[PDB]
């Protein structure tokens, strides 16, 4: 179970990293929506990660 939680935690961390890459892409793109989505997703994930 501990290993499973770690894997889930790792996935959340990976998702945040993926979102960060998207955010970098968003800045070049200049689209407000893409940047906003990444920031919101990162915050909830961080809270979830803390709980995990």
């Amino acid at each position: 179970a501990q290993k499973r939680s770690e894997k889930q935690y790792n996935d959340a961390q990976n998702e945040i990293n993926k979102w960060q890459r998207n955010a970098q892409l968003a800045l070049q793109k200049g689209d407000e929506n893409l940047a906003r989505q990444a920031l919101e997703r990162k915050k909830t994930y961080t809270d979830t990660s803390a709980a995990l």
């Binding site: 955010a23 968003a26 800045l27 070049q28 200049g30 407000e32 940047a35 906003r36 920031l39 919101e40």
Partner: peptide, 11 residues
């Protein structure tokens, strides 16, 4: 968040 986004958009 919007203010932060605007700075990012400037790139």
């Amino acid at each position: 968040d919007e203010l932060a986004a605007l700075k990012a958009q400037m790139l």
